[PDB]
Amino acid sequence: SLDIPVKQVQIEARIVTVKEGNLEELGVRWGVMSTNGSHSVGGSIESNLWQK
Amino acid sequence: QITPDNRLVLDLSVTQDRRGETVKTGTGEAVSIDTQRIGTQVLVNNGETVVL
């Protein structure tokens, strides 16, 4: 009664992955340098000491 | 194993490995292995093919 043919099974796994990304950057760089005669304007102290 | 009604029960191991890159281990190095393996027990008719 025990020894009989058995069944068979088919198993299928499925792994799925999805990715998205976005990036944005804005930047600014500016400078000035002016002199008037005994009067100056700059962006640092070494700047004013150089334009002399 | 051969059964009465023209069928086989197979205990199967099939592999296909290769030699891979040489990774770093401690202060030393060693060789890694790339593998594909399947091991099963199946039941298949006498002279035909099945996909494992």
Cα end-to-end distance, chain B, whole Å? 18
CB B42 within 8 A of CB B29: no
Would you state the structure tokens that stand for residue A20, as one six-digit string? 């998205």
B41 CB contacts (<8 Å, ≥6 apart)?
A: B9, B10, B11, B12
Helix (H, G, I), strand (E, B), or coil: what is residue B35? coil
Q: Distance between CA atoms of B52 and B49, rounded to whole angstroms?
A: 9
**Least CA distance to B43: which residue of chain A?**
A8
Residue A48 CB neighbours (<10 A): 14
User: At what resolution in Å was this solved?
Assistant: 2.7
Q: What is the DSSP letter of A44?
A: S
Q: A6 vs B3: CB contact, 8 Å cut-off?
A: no
Instruction: Map A6-43 to HEC letters.
Output: CCCCCCCCCCCCCCCCCCCCCCCCCCCCEECCCCEECC
Give the bridge partners for A23, in sequence order: none
- A and B: number of Cβ contacts within 8 A: 7
Question: How far, CA to CA in Å, does B6 sit from each of A2, A6, B26, B40, B43?
Answer: 19, 15, 56, 20, 11
Q: A5 vs B42: CB contact, 8 Å cut-off?
A: no
Which of B6, B50, B46, B2 minimizes the C-alpha distance to A10?
B50
A27 touches chain B (CB under 8 A): no
Q: A5 vs B7: CB contact, 8 Å cut-off?
A: yes
Q: Distance between CA atoms of A17 and A14, rounded to whole angstroms?
A: 10
Which of B13, B4, B12, B7 minimizes the C-alpha distance to B43?
B7
Question: How far, CA to CA in Å, does A9 sit from each of A6, A25, B42?
Answer: 10, 55, 10
